Design an enzyme around this catalytic site. Sequence first.
Site: not given
Ligand SMILES: Cc1ncc(COP(=O)(O)O)c(C/N=C(\CN2CCc3ccccc32)C(=O)O)c1O
Lengths: 266, 266, 393, 393
Positions: D86, D108, D376
């Site tokens: 992220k 968010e 990730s």
């Molecule tokens: C360590 C980790 N690995 C994967 C993911 C999944 O998100 P991807 O965008 O890589 O598919 C996360 C996700 N974590 C969060 C949620 N995110 C941020 C805003 C959002 C909207 C819709 C879907 C996913 C997200 C977070 O940490 O907020 C992760 O932490």
Amino acid sequence: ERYENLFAQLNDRREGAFVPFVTLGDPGIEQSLKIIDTLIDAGADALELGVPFSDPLADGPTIQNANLRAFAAGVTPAQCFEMLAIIREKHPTIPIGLLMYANLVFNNGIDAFYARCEQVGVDSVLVADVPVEESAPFRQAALRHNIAPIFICPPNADDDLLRQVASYGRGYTYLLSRSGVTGAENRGALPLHHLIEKLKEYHAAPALQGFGISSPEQVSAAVRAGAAGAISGSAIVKIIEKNLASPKQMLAELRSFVSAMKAASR
Amino acid sequence: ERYENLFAQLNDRREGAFVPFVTLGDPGIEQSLKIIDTLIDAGADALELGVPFSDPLADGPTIQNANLRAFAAGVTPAQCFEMLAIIREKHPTIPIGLLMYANLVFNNGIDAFYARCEQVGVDSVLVADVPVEESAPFRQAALRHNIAPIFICPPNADDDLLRQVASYGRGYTYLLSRSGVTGAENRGALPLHHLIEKLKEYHAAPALQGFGISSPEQVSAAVRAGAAGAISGSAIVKIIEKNLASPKQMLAELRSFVSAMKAASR
Amino acid sequence: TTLLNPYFGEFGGMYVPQILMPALNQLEEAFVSAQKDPEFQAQFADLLKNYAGRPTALTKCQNITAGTRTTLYLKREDLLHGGAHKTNQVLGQALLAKRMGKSEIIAETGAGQHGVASALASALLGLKCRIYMGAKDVERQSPNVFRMRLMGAEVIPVHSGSATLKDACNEALRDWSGSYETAHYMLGTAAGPHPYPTIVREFQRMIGEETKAQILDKEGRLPDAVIACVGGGSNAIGMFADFINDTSVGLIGVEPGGHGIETGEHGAPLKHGRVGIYFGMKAPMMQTADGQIEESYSISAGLDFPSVGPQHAYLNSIGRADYVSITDDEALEAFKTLCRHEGIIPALESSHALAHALKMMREQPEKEQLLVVNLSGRGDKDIFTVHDILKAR
Amino acid sequence: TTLLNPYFGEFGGMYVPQILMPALNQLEEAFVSAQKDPEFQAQFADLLKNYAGRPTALTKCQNITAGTRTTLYLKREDLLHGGAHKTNQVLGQALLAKRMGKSEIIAETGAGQHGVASALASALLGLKCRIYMGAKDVERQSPNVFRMRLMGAEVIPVHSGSATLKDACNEALRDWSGSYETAHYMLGTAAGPHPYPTIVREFQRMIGEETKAQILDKEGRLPDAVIACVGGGSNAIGMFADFINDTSVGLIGVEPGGHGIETGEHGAPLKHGRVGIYFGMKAPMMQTADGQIEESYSISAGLDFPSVGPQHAYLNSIGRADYVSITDDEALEAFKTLCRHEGIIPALESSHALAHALKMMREQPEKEQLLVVNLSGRGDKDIFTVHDILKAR
Ligand SMILES: Cc1ncc(COP(=O)(O)O)c(C/N=C(\CN2CCc3ccccc32)C(=O)O)c1O
Ligand SMILES: Cc1ncc(COP(=O)(O)O)c(C/N=C(\CN2CCc3ccccc32)C(=O)O)c1O
Ligand SMILES: O=P(O)(O)OC[C@H](O)[C@H](O)N1CCc2ccccc21
Ligand SMILES: O=P(O)(O)OC[C@H](O)[C@H](O)N1CCc2ccccc21
Ligand SMILES: [Cs+]
Ligand SMILES: [Cs+]
Ligand SMILES: [Cs+]
Ligand SMILES: [Cs+]
Ligand SMILES: [Cs+]
């Protein structure tokens, strides 16, 4: 020359030594002095006495708690030397050995420590965390003040160590029954015959087995193996611990144990 | 041609429009139908009606809770169209506008949605999350089924947007009083005079101001600024929310508010 | 007899029961051998690079030193796998352990970062890991107890004494005394009996070597000073080692001042203790007049230890390195400052190093100085402890 | 009118209220401009390298694939500063935000990893950060709430709806609707209205670029497949992007299967949903027959979202990339396996990617395959959640 005289008298009597250990001032100074007189009266050939130390690294919980009981009684190294002087006053000929940790010896000067030992009539000092490799100022200061420096012969001793222990030590060689820390439950099973004969070959001070000796059978076995005797610590201390609320029964049970342990040394 | 007829009648009467909004089926189907009849009876020139949607992104808590009340009553899009048909049956000439979110329009086919709208006698559709940039299939399907597609003219509108809203929209132009989401507490203060005249220049459908209109003074100001009228949503819904346990007093307070708001439009 | 010098001037040695001497000699031999072994070095290198994540970044602060002539870089050991510098040397020691045919690991932990490192290395390389941790630290460094256990390590609470690092050290050594044939004692700091202070330094020296290379690339010169907290001395000596012969480079160690040195509730034996013999070494100790070992105190579990490694006592005595103290409150302020102005959450241990660096800058803001703080770890483990304190205020 | 294509085949677009269109157009313009700006690129590069810790390691597993012909590498985004991938894109977006003269950030969060990243970037670069997080996630991802707040971000619990990511997304967008002039909405995934899916991909593409370079150096060829979990699509597209034109390289996305797809309690709209319009985009949605948005479920907060980014829907439709699902229990087993056999604690999100890779290997152990899992993030945040579950068993 209390150790020399003792082992001469014991060999003359075709007898092994029984050496009980206690922590000085456990559970209090008065009761501890009584304990020690009872140990002697019941037939202790020599005494090993511990000075309460904050972090006894070579000790299991039984003796760990002996140190704590003493500290709870407010027992200091200085009060221990008052006890020793009083003990020596009553018993002129019994060998008295100290079990020390290095910091207590090194604290206000190694020489100063051994000089005080002599002053009070201590015969030997065992420093648990000082191996032969670090012992030089310790054994020199001991000899300067007519104190026997004691060294442990561990089961994993090589020949060079054996010859070092034989030359550096005096009074008695501490023959370690097993690895680990002190404890009556953990008994040494490994045969020590090979070490005893090598120590006799190199003219080491008479060997006493210690660690996990808590029964008369272990005393006899030790003697039959060729050792000059056996040391029991945690077993002794457990009787103190068990009878803390019954001071009279403590001495009764201690007398019984020492008497039984000494009998088996013959 | 209900919007065309209304604005013709209002201009003839030198009068602005008052348009109240409610969520269909809040707090239940029966009471909602009564609410709507009361809104009309008290002097609503047109109606804006919302289909309960799961995630109303352009809405503050007041209307968010209107959607939830409807859902708690089990209100579906299909039941909303039954209501609309019943409303149109009773009131042949009042313009009826829908406030939609895109997914509800797109769900079972955009064409199918507008065809149903026409079938029930809806006059316009506002899709809150479909900007002019994404509106093509929406406004085409609307026009195909004689529905007015409604577009928002925001305070931050440039000239190209203005001309797009003027050409693409029908019935009325939605003149947004401020940024943010729906809410009676958050009032628009920024002057809209510049936008109204430009919309009139480009021959846009008559403008109605909406967002934060909750007092008669805001209705009059809107009219005096040159707007064809004013829309009140959250203010209306707050009276429903406040009087949920007092259904008769709800309609009483609603009639008073609409009557006061309509008076100020003259 | 040893292959290497056990002493740093007066300090060091091998003050263990005779039973453990062969273990220590075997370890020293294995180490000398491995150090000459290109295959060991390549494997160690591989783990450090491809598993741990080395080299770690050297981050220039560009907010916290605003308005001053201090330039501050942080050596980012907080970025290392596991979340502290501790991981470097455990990976080397674990390889040594295998090299000696050992299948079990004994470790002590306070911050739980060495524990976590010992557990992760043991999972990776197929060792059975048991970890001694004082009951107090189990509680104040809880996130790491979860982490350790999840990785299949046994965590053993120690309730004896101060119920902190010292007491965990006791139990680990007592254990090893009876298990040395099968278990390697993975000591966690540059302290204890020889060869540990030497081994831990050599397996941490990449910190200072990287820092040197990095600062030369970024700044075209060496630092004016490198600054590091001192729990037992591993991260600091890791930082210092390659800079010792660079005489212009100041070497600054930060001991926990706790509630204040004048309170006696601190962990600063190097500057406020007295030479003694304990934990296998002759070193500065907090001890009573009678020679009993004092219990230490620090907000930081990883610094809450009443002694210090012999090479630091040495480097101080000759005036090569300088040692200071930072209190709990000083360390906390530095913790908050880094969080909010650089977006980095440091360990409370590391925060001691940062606090002093911030003092260097604040005390003399117009003094031109290029400083490196070893940010030994991240403060994920301190999160709740810090919260509970700040809330109480 | 836009500079770049808002659509990926049928998917994407800019389905926002008209009020937000200028914000989106301004953002797209700023992005196109920055991408051509060598000074922006150098600054972004500098932050990634010297602050975040890039390049991240590519770790070869040498235990978990024993007895099989699977070779598995993990791309170590868990080693990145903050503890997840992220951080990469928030650093780019934060620079864009400053470039547009914005002083506030709206974000968010679900896993709290994007939140933590948004907070740390805002601390560093001088932005006022407010973060929307569902009440449920505040609880199950608590360590990150502490971390965020310590760094000076405002964390706002959302109790509406499912009280998870979807609902946090709602509130963030509603907020931005009224604050766009002063606040930049730092969307956390490759989803939402154009230009976000495009920007997030471009600011995550270094993952796949590094992976390519790394695997070539270690293996002399490309991977057979790269595998990544899909919450909204950022880490996966970050991994995939540089491999899209490498047709031999399989691209595999893993959606949360939750309690089982057949239960309806899952987060797998790409394979088990239906195209709809919501969250600013036309994309696969979990929705009722009536077109109401369904609440999703996952053990993993970061995957617990009832939609998915448009480029994945696209890449699937043309059969470039393949999407599967992994359940809670599958993800947990993989979590435990990595912990205990590689000494790495993964995020429960990442564990979904690993679980499928482990299935690929286990299902066909004699199939020769070179796999890369994008790890990730790290699982420090999941520690208590995992404990509470395992204890309950
Ligand atoms: C360590 C980790 N690995 C994967 C993911 C999944 O998100 P991807 O965008 O890589 O598919 C996360 C996700 N974590 C969060 C949620 N995110 C941020 C805003 C959002 C909207 C819709 C879907 C996913 C997200 C977070 O940490 O907020 C992760 O932490
Ligand atoms: C993040 C972090 N930073 C510094 C320190 C201090 O130790 P040094 O060895 O670098 O001076 C720690 C320490 N953490 C632990 C305690 N260690 C391990 C065994 C030990 C014995 C004596 C003194 C210090 C230690 C730990 O994590 O167990 C740290 O975590
Ligand atoms: O206590 P046990 O019976 O195991 O025998 C050891 C005994 O305690 C010992 O003679 N003495 C007391 C404490 C100690 C520590 C190291 C070496 C010798 C002793
Ligand atoms: O509710 P207020 O008075 O702020 O005015 C807005 C009103 O709600 C509106 O006409 N209508 C209902 C919900 C909604 C959403 C977007 C655009 C218009 C509306
Ligand atoms: Cs500066
Ligand atoms: Cs210390
Ligand atoms: Cs790195
Ligand atoms: Cs393999
Ligand atoms: Cs999802």
